Amino acid sequence: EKRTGLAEDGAKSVYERLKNDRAPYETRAQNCAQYTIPSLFPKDSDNASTDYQTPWQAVGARGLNNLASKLMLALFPMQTWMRLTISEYEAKQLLSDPDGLAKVDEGLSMVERIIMNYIESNSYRVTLFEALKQLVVAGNVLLYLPEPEGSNYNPMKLYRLSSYVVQRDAFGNVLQMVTRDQIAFGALPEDIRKAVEGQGGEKKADETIDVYTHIYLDEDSGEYLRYEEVEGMEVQGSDGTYPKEACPYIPIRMVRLDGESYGRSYIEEYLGDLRSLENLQEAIVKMSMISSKVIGLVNPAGITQPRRLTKAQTGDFVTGRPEDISFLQLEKQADFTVAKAVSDAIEARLSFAFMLNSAVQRTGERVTAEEIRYVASELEDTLGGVYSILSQELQLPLVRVLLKQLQATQQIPELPKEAVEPTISTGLEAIGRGQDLDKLERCVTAWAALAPMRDDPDINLAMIKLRIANAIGIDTSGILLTE
Amino acid sequence: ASTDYQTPWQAVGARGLNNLASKLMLALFPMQTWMRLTISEYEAKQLLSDPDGLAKVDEGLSMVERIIMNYIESNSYRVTLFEALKQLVVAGNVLLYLPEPEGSNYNPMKLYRLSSYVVQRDAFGNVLQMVTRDQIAFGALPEDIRKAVEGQGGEKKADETIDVYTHIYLDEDSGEYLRYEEVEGMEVQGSDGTYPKEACPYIPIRMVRLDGESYGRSYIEEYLGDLRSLENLQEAIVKMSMISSKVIGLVNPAGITQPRRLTKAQTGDFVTGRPEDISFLQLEKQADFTVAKAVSDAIEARLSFAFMLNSAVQRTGERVTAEEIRYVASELEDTLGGVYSILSQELQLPLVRVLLKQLQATQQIPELPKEAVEPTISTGLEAIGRGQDL
Amino acid sequence: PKEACPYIPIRMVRLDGESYGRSYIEEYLGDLRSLENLQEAIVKMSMIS
Amino acid sequence: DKLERCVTAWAALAPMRDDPDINLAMIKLRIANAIGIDTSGILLTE
DSSP states (O other): OOOOGGGTTOHHHHHHHHHHHHHHHHHHHHHHHHHHOGGGSOOSSOOSSOOOOOOSOSHHHHHHHHHHHHHHHHHSOSSOOOEEEOOSSHHHHSSSOTTTHHHHHHHHHHHHHHHHHHHHHTTHHHHHHHHHHHHHHSSEEEEEOOOOOSSSOOOOEEEOGGGEEEEEOSSOOEEEEEEOOEEESTTSOHHHHHHHHHHOSOOOSSOEEEEEEEEEEOSSSSSEEEEEEESSSBOTTOOEEEOSSOOSEEEEESBOOTTOSSOBOTTGGGSHHHHHHHHHHHHHHHHHHHHTOOEEEEOTTSSOOHHHHTTSOTTOOOOOOTTTEEEOOOOOSHHHHHHHHHHHHHHHHHHHHHTOOSSSSOTTOOSSSSHHHHHHHHHHHSSTTHHHHHIIIIIHHHHHHHHHHHHHHSOOOSOOTTSSSOEEEOSTTSSSSSSOHHHHHHHHHHHHTTOSOTTOTTSOSHHHHHHHHHHTTOOOSSSSOOO | OOOOOOOOSOSHHHHHHHHHHHHHHHHHSOSSOOOEEEOOSSHHHHSSSOTTTHHHHHHHHHHHHHHHHHHHHHTTHHHHHHHHHHHHHHSSEEEEEOOOOOSSSOOOOEEEOGGGEEEEEOSSOOEEEEEEOOEEESTTSOHHHHHHHHHHOSOOOSSOEEEEEEEEEEOSSSSSEEEEEEESSSBOTTOOEEEOSSOOSEEEEESBOOTTOSSOBOTTGGGSHHHHHHHHHHHHHHHHHHHHTOOOEEEOTTSSOOHHHHTTSOTTEEEEOOTTTEEEOOOOOSHHHHHHHHHHHHHHHHHHHHHTOOSSSSOTTOOSSSSHHHHHHHHHHHSSTTHHHHHIIIIIHHHHHHHHHHHHHHSOOOSOOTTSSSOEEEOSTTSSSSSSOO | OOSOOSOOOOOSBOOTTOSSOBOTTGGGSHHHHHHHHHHHHHHHHHHHO | OHHHHHHHHHHTTOSOTTOTTSOSHHHHHHHHHHTTOOOSSSSOOO
């Protein structure tokens, strides 16, 4: 009845203590936002009628959205993107019965379809796109998917970097998290209203109430404990025990670093050439505006005078020489050409770096056939390890929390006891279900090349079909007859 | 911890490291089967007769290859291997360690970058000893280590960091490794280990080996200087650009025009002055700018043929698995020197070998004969596909 | 009921802790207005001709 | 595009119904299941 161990002083205390170590990542987030798209991460004061200004450069703004879109095209497509398989007891099972694992395939495809349906229904696509924009501009996002509590609408609560905190060790084991939702008293969950009301004093409807959610490692066991706190007291009937692997609070980092509790954004690594673009581009716009100020210089040594140019109607003769009036130009030409040259040469870097279109995806883009393969292969070509690190950090828990809670609610089908608790694959190993569409297509054409004779003498047919199939990426374990 | 890394002035390095790591992964750990399990020196008894006889052996070994591949896909070795390849290209040494599986639950592979381990060798390359220096919190320790630390004395906080050390050493008696753990100056009870010579779970990987030298030197080291000569030569240019982005209006004092009258005038206001009086300060490095840009380009060309940056090879409609892995590996041995083969001997042999030991020590052995229970392994271009050439 | 509210308030680009929405044109307003000025002049400078 | 290219990939499986040394029941499912097809009424079970 007293929280001990890591949660010794309540959630607000831990949150305010760890906010100091949160702060620099937030500063980086603000800077990256100021150079890319300013609204996407405000400052903590600069809210509510603050008029974000566009950056002088446009490559940042294009680049953040393009990179988030391509990450979403390769990480959460229309297709099945997870894979549910069986290990270390299938050696009992997969030895015999190539007709036996077909029931297991049907059961697991049923489970994959039901997870995908829960994805499409509850609008995880919208919140995941938002989370990817946060994960590219800033370094850290925190997703939380609640208990479903019915088949009604249950979206996923996002947490941008300002409103949560995470402490780690030098591994990357998450020791503790605290979130800092600010909800109105009127729209609270019902149990929390009574817990706040018990503290005392009547409340207005729109008076803001800050909750804090704390998740911590136990001093006793290897499982998480969660509680809520409002105003300095643990919320009654909001206790929680969570297993080690099915933690519903998922903290996501884009680029990890050793012995460091948070993540650093992908835009950070190319920030400087971003800001060097900014300056170099800024000037140009400013230097343009100087050109847009006509000043007529009249030469005092001459004759012509502007009480007579101006008052004359059009096509009126008037007295004067033409060498007297001139106009003030701005003769930066060599500076303008060198500034434009380095501006271009820096946008080229940021275009190969942010996947801006260098004639890859323009020429008649389609869906689902060769497309997701190409997108993911390019996203691992550039971007470093974003697509794989992101797949380990994001998709494993997003399948794992779903697979826990949904099958803890819905129906378990026919499939055996070694496939009730399955293993999950997520990345390029899990796109499609089979290895490669091009493999199966060219393998079928290579089989069609084996037209001429069934019982062709002086040759084999049973092994060479297996060999042409087994040279390309085919399983060859149900594709070919044994007996 | 809040140090704000700065981007380099050149961009060829950044593109190049990621491209090289990606192409190494495309040719070293693809979607396909990438190891090969075969039989030697007793198959001469067996392969003489029964061309229908080795088909059962083929089926058994393809079953074992599939089960190793499944354990690869499930436990996310792809993510940690990509990280390890980026470490192995930028720095010279990585240390992978795959633990005992202890069930079919999630077991990823613990990486160790160069700062946190150490390796002593002889002038062969026999690994004599390794020590790793994981820094784990007291709260998230394994259960046996918590009691070993607690026995040392004093209560501990939850987030108080505890440095373990893992030591692996050659025996003075036999030719097998011995491992132990240590916290705070005492060997951890119930953490003893004896490991066979070939199935060592701690795999130290070097990119480019050198004789009589215990560590590895990165591939970026060999082209570092032309990298840094790019850096400087490029740096200036950006700096020299910024000088151009400072408008200073020089007004000629000998003349008439004066800037209390240019500025206050609205647009299209006549005002007095001659045009030869105001000019603007340019930066007249033009021949220096053209020679600097020329040598910059000519040095990026080298680093592009050196880091496999796109010189119109992989752009024109890239596909998967058919002619692709062959082409990638053949080019990665064309350039890069011996990276693809040295890396295959150092990396893929132990990563198959440790798996093949521990998994088949846990899971089921099929029908196949006694000369194929303990097989031989092929890894590189000899093992891409199963057959020789599509 | 909570889910079938016939009054639907729509925001284009949402922000945290802020009751309204900010338009998509806002984010590119400035380069919009810098076009405006830079273009305005030109038309004015034409008319002098 | 998935259904169209999947139907053409099935049409590539012309030559023989009862073609020896090969399966047909699973490979149609696999070529369909590599691209974005539900495969849950598209293919016969029983």
